[PDB]
Amino acid sequence: VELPAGNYILVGVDIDTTGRRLMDEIVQLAAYTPTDHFEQYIMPYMNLNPAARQRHQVRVISIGFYRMLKSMQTYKIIKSKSEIAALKDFLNWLEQLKTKAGPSSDGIVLIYHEERKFIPYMILESLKKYGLLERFTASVKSFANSINLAKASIIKNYSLRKLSKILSLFDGNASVRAKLAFDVALQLSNSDGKPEPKSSEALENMFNAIRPFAKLVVSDVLELDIQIENLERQN
Amino acid sequence: VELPAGNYILVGVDIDTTGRRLMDEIVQLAAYTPTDHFEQYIMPYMNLNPAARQRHQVRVISIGFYRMLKSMQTYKIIKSKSEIAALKDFLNWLEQLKTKAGPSSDGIVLIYHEERKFIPYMILESLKKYGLLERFTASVKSFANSINLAKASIIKNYSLRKLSKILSLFDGNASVRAKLAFDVALQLSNSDGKPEPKSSEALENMFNAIRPFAKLVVSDVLELDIQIENLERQN
Numbered sequence: 444v445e446l447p448a449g450n451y452i453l454v455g456v457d458i459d460t461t462g463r464r465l466m467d468e469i470v471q472l473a474a475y476t477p478t479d480h481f482e483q484y485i486m487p488y489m490n491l492n493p494a495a496r497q498r499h500q501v502r503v504i505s506i507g508f509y510r511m512l513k514s515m516q517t518y519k520i521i522k523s524k525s526e527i528a529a530l531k532d533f534l535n536w537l538e539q540l541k542t543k544a545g546p547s548s549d550g551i552v553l554i555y556h557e558e559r560k561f562i563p564y565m566i567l568e569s570l571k572k573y574g575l576l577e578r579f580t581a582s583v584k585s586f587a588n589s590i591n592l593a594k595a596s597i598i599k600n601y602s603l604r605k606l607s608k609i610l611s612l613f614d615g616n617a618s619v620r621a622k623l624a625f626d627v628a629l630q631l632s633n634s635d636g637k638p639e640p641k642s643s644e645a646l647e648n649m650f651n652a653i654r655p656f657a658k659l660v661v662s663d664v665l666e667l668d669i670q671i672e673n674l675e676r677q678n
Numbered sequence: 679v680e681l682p683a684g685n686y687i688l689v690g691v692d693i694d695t696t697g698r699r700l701m702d703e704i705v706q707l708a709a710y711t712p713t714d715h716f717e718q719y720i721m722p723y724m725n726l727n728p729a730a731r732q733r734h735q736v737r738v739i740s741i742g743f744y745r746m747l748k749s750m751q752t753y754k755i756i757k758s759k760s761e762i763a764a765l766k767d768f769l770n771w772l773e774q775l776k777t778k779a780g781p782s783s784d785g786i787v788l789i790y791h792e793e794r795k796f797i798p799y800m801i802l803e804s805l806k807k808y809g810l811l812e813r814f815t816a817s818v819k820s821f822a823n824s825i826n827l828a829k830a831s832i833i834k835n836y837s838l839r840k841l842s843k844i845l846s847l848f849d850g851n852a853s854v855r856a857k858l859a860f861d862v863a864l865q866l867s868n869s870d871g872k873p874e875p876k877s878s879e880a881l882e883n884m885f886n887a888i889r890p891f892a893k894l895v896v897s898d899v900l901e902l903d904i905q906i907e908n909l910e911r912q913n
Contacts (some may be wrong), residue, residue, distance in 0.1 A: 488721055490743035508696070508725035528806060573762060573808060
């Protein structure tokens with residue numbers, strides 16, 4: 444246990460990418476709270492690999508010398524921004540969130556849900572890329588994988604949509620998974636299928652349930668730096 | 679005249695791009711001094727347009743879901759970096775340059791050569807994109823178009839390679855043009871076909887010849903902000 448007790452804002456988060464390795468790129472960044480959500484598509488330098496195209500149902504098309512994202516469900520063009528502009532929007536969103544919580548807020552805990560740690564590494568890598576890590580840490584204090592709650596309430600492997608249906612939308616979309624990660628964690632932490640997301644005790648139960656798994660940003664950065672040191676040598 | 683007198687480092691600069699509009703992207707950034715040069719290819723999000731491909735003899739190819747630059751002269755792959763990483767290398771290069779000049783240096787004057795002002799706007803836009811403008815201004819104090827020297831020594835339109843041959847390599851390459859812009863300005867400012875680039879007086883003649891056309895970085899940023907305000911409305 445390394446995240447000290449306090450008054451935190453709980454925020455679900457997830458990402459869509461061109462692949463499942465640290466060298467790949469974020470294509471959508473999404474975050475969620477019951478009263479506020481954020482999502483932004485990001486234009487990659489490369490194209491999504493076959494598995495990523497199928498997973499997210501998004502691909503890159505070319506029109507002459509221009510490239511742009513396209514939905515494989517609606518067949519409509521997807522408006523996107525650069526990675527830096529999307530991150531600056533994300534940081535502003537995190538900051539107005541901590542602001543709205545008042546001077547008693549100790550920061551934000553980003554909650555993600557996955558078997559193989561990936562989401563926090565990719566986000567921290569993109570922040571580190573542009574020198575935004577210091578600004579980020581002013582708002583966010585920890586990433587916390589909520590999958591451990593699911594492991595304690597089970598049954599080996601169960602997806603998010605699988606857990607949500609049991610405890611009670613296209614899950615290839617990061618914005619859908621950011622909501623699911625939050626709600627599933629709120630349900631499991633309260634032993635309730637329909638908890639009140641605006642209830643002080645419900646959110647307090649949620650925080651205390653995930654706190655043992657919450658890592659400080661500094662801790663994940665060190666894990667990130669190590670994983671990057673290996674790929675550079677193992678290349 | 680807005681650049682005050684002082685002890686400056688003169689540096690030729692030029693860029694290769696996907697097009698000739700502020701919405702396009704830098705594909706190579708290059709700078710030059712007689713004893714030190716910098717050049718880095720940059721991976722664009724879009725492809726180069728037909729005119730840009732012909733001009734620089736570089737294009738983007740796809741290998742599966744990967745994209746990469748390729749030389750249309752050598753047919754070999756061109757290693758490239760992201761725009762942010764290239765800029766950070768560029769800033770470090772500018773800084774070790776001002777460092778090597780000692781504590782008496784007043785900064786760097788970037789010298790470019792073109793009829794239609796473009797080079798400074800593109801570089802400043804990319805710096806502003808990543809929040810590097812403040813760091814940039816610590817080393818560089820002005821962009822200065824040396825084409826006015828050529829206009830005074832002529833004859834309407836003469837290219838760089840044209841002037842160099844008269845006063846005395848593929849000019850689609852930004853690194854070749856960065857050298858030419860410097861040498862032509864050194865030749866014209868000294869009324870000499872073979873001036874000594876390590877001569878204190880030769881460099882002093884060069885600086886004083888271009889000083890009347892040297893704009894402060896702040897002045898070009900304001901011009902940049904205006905040009906961007908027009909395109910957003912004229913879109």
